[PDB]
Amino acid sequence: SGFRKMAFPSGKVEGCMVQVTCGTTTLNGLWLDDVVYCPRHVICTSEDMLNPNYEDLLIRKSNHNFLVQAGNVQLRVIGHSMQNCVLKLKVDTANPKTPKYKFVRIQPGQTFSVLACYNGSPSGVYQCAMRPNFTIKGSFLNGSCGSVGFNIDYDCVSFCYMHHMELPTGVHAGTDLEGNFYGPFVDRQTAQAAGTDTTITVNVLAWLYAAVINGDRWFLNRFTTTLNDFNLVAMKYNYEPLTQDHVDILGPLSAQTGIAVLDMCASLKELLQNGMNGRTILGSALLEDEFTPFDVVRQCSGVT
Amino acid sequence: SGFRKMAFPSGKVEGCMVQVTCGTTTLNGLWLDDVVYCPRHVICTSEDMLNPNYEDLLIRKSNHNFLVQAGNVQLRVIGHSMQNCVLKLKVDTANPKTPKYKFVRIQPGQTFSVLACYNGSPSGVYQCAMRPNFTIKGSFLNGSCGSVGFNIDYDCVSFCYMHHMELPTGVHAGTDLEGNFYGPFVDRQTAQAAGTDTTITVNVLAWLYAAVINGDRWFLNRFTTTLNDFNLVAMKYNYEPLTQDHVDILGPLSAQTGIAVLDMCASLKELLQNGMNGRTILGSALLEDEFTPFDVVRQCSGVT
Numbered sequence: 001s002g003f004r005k006m007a008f009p010s011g012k013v014e015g016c017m018v019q020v021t022c023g024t025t026t027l028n029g030l031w032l033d034d035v036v037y038c039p040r041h042v043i044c045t046s047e048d049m050l051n052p053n054y055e056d057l058l059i060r061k062s063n064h065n066f067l068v069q070a071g072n073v074q075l076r077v078i079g080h081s082m083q084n085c086v087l088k089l090k091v092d093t094a095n096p097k098t099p100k101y102k103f104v105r106i107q108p109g110q111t112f113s114v115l116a117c118y119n120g121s122p123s124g125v126y127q128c129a130m131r132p133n134f135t136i137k138g139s140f141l142n143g144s145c146g147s148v149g150f151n152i153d154y155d156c157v158s159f160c161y162m163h164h165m166e167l168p169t170g171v172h173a174g175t176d177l178e179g180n181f182y183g184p185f186v187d188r189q190t191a192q193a194a195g196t197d198t199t200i201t202v203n204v205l206a207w208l209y210a211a212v213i214n215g216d217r218w219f220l221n222r223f224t225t226t227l228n229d230f231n232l233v234a235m236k237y238n239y240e241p242l243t244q245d246h247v248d249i250l251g252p253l254s255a256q257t258g259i260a261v262l263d264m265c266a267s268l269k270e271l272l273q274n275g276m277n278g279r280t281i282l283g284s285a286l287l288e289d290e291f292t293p294f295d296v297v298r299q300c301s302g303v304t
Numbered sequence: 305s306g307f308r309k310m311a312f313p314s315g316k317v318e319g320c321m322v323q324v325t326c327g328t329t330t331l332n333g334l335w336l337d338d339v340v341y342c343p344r345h346v347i348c349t350s351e352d353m354l355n356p357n358y359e360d361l362l363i364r365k366s367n368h369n370f371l372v373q374a375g376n377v378q379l380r381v382i383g384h385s386m387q388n389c390v391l392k393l394k395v396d397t398a399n400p401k402t403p404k405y406k407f408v409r410i411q412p413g414q415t416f417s418v419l420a421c422y423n424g425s426p427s428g429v430y431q432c433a434m435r436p437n438f439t440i441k442g443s444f445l446n447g448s449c450g451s452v453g454f455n456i457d458y459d460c461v462s463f464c465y466m467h468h469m470e471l472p473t474g475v476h477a478g479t480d481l482e483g484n485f486y487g488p489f490v491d492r493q494t495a496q497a498a499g500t501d502t503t504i505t506v507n508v509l510a511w512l513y514a515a516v517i518n519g520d521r522w523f524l525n526r527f528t529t530t531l532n533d534f535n536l537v538a539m540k541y542n543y544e545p546l547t548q549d550h551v552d553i554l555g556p557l558s559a560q561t562g563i564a565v566l567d568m569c570a571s572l573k574e575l576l577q578n579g580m581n582g583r584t585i586l587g588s589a590l591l592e593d594e595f596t597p598f599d600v601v602r603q604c605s606g607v608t
């Protein structure tokens with residue numbers, strides 16, 4: 001028993017982290033096979049970030065201008081190309097530590113592990129959720145650009161995120177591994193705001209199931225509700241509308257606990273309307289939305 | 305900016321995880337050099353755990369009874385010995401993936417990363433604190449025994465914890481890497497209770513400094529206090545007494561923010577007496593005590 005914000009073991013990703021330098025800018029790159037992926041803003045200076053013309057900026061750059069360092073050895077760059085907001089540097093050596101990998105674009109509300117890096121070196125790993133407004137509430141500093149987000153399925157690493165920027169609000173924005181930003185963000189030092197962020201309802205429900213599984217049952221009540229009545233309350237509290245697909249995905253947790261999804265919705269409804277009354281659930285005084293139903297099942301069943 | 309419960313990158317520890325089987329029991333082992341460390345309760349059956357005589361039980365065991373598997377290859381056991389509550393299995397092959405390592409006994413209130421494992425395979429990594437009552441509030445299931453806790457200093461892994469058992473209260477107990485339990489716990493299926501757990505005051509203060517550093521300043525007030533007045537409040541709220549050493553250790557954070565330690569204590573005093581009034585700090589509705597002043601400095605400075 002016990003329930004933690006658990007990240008995937010990061011070893012397979014650490015073996016791919018490299019340092020990429022261009023001019024005076026240093027950030028992190030992801031070395032998979034003979035290709036190094038990093039944010040294209042590596043070619044900019046502090047002046048260029050105001051309104052960069054990346055095609056024009058990249059044109060003033062040659063393979064020899066990009067310095068890729070893996071640990072303490074230099075990689076030879078034989079090709080360079082821009083794909084959306086990422087630079088793909090072709091190196092003459094394939095990464096001997098390349099794990100089985102896929103590039104995937106996650107959906108808002110899905111979770112992933114982040115290996116925060118500085119100078120191609122990993123410093124920490126944490127679990128994140130892609131917010132409905134496509135931002136991530138991560139922990140990043142200057143130099144963290146190129147740090148990646150991922151999921152692991154037995155031996156396969158699914159890369160889903162590359163860190164690019166911190167918005168003035170403190171939240172983080174980035175791209176998938178093809179360089180397409182999650183959300184409306186652009187890689188430019190201009191004031192950009194994320195939309196209204198909502199709470200991932202299906203994830204809060206999954207976490208309420210984890211709480212029941214772990215002995216915390218105080219919030220369970222003698223009431224029930226309908227999808228329509230529940231969603232009226234969800235809209236008032238800026239919670240994502242619950243669909244029948246969300247109910248379907250909660251099926252394994254509903255079967256494990258013997259608590260119907262709509263009965264759990266009625267508990268959530270009363271938690272929303274009445275608050276926690278100074279009590280906690282799984283050690284938290286607020287409703288946690290950063291565990292998907294898959295994460296709860298995985299953590300509570302022991303999927304290695 | 306941003307602040308997360310960040311764990312160390314776990315790669316160096318994954319390369320040491322092995323499966324150890326004895327009779328019908330399977331748990332995790334830690335393979336460093338030519339030695340495999342695992343809980344000694346691997347030699348017990350469900351009947352033996354009631355009141356085991358480990359010396360007598362180990363006597364009925366030979367090197368060939370302990371099956372050590374690293375990935376998919378079998379390790380040859382040439383020696384076996386019990387050191388307190390751990391078995392040390394001497395294998396004929398030194399782990400090629402052995403990182404630079406130390407065995408350390410952490411102090412209550414200190415933090416560490418846990419790589420939860422099942423069948424010698426890692427499934428997740430999370431950050432924990434050794435509670436003042438020597439328990440850890442981890443996330444463990446049956447099969448997790450032998451999972452280790454550690455800290456990393458550049459290239460050196462300091463192993464501090466090995467998981468042994470879950471108490472009936474749901475909290476977790478284990479040993480250092482010499483087999484000495486943290487706390488009064490014994491490796492026996494008998495009702496054992498942990499002491500009263502207090503809040504790690506110095507860690508809550510360090511987290512209040514992280515909150516100031518990250519823009520969350522609502523809780524800062526026009527008041528101050530003394531060590532004596534503050535500790536009167538700390539005792540009423542089951543908070544560890546704050547000593548001048550704790551104030552000294554908070555020095556870097558005090559210097560970074562320009563907020564004197566006793567001024568931060570006065571903010572904590574009012575948070576304790578008045579609650580959060582429905583507000584949050586760093587995304588939490590309660591006072592977080594699982595970040596030491598070192599963790600806050602590391603996370604907020606980017607130590608890789």
Ligand SMILES: O=C(Cc1cccc(Cl)c1)Nn1cnc2ccccc21
Nearest residue numbers: 140141142164165166187188189305
């Ligand atoms: O935000 C940037 C630089 C940048 C400016 C404008 C656009 C772009 Cl794409 C990049 N880097 N960055 C990422 N996370 C950080 C956290 C703290 C400070 C800087 C951090």
Ligand SMILES: O=C(Cc1cccc(Cl)c1)Nn1cnc2ccccc21
Nearest residue numbers: 001444445446468469470491492493
């Ligand atoms: O508690 C035990 C078995 C055991 C019984 C008595 C004493 C000893 Cl040393 C070990 N294993 N264990 C550890 N974490 C767990 C979590 C959920 C279930 C079982 C888990």
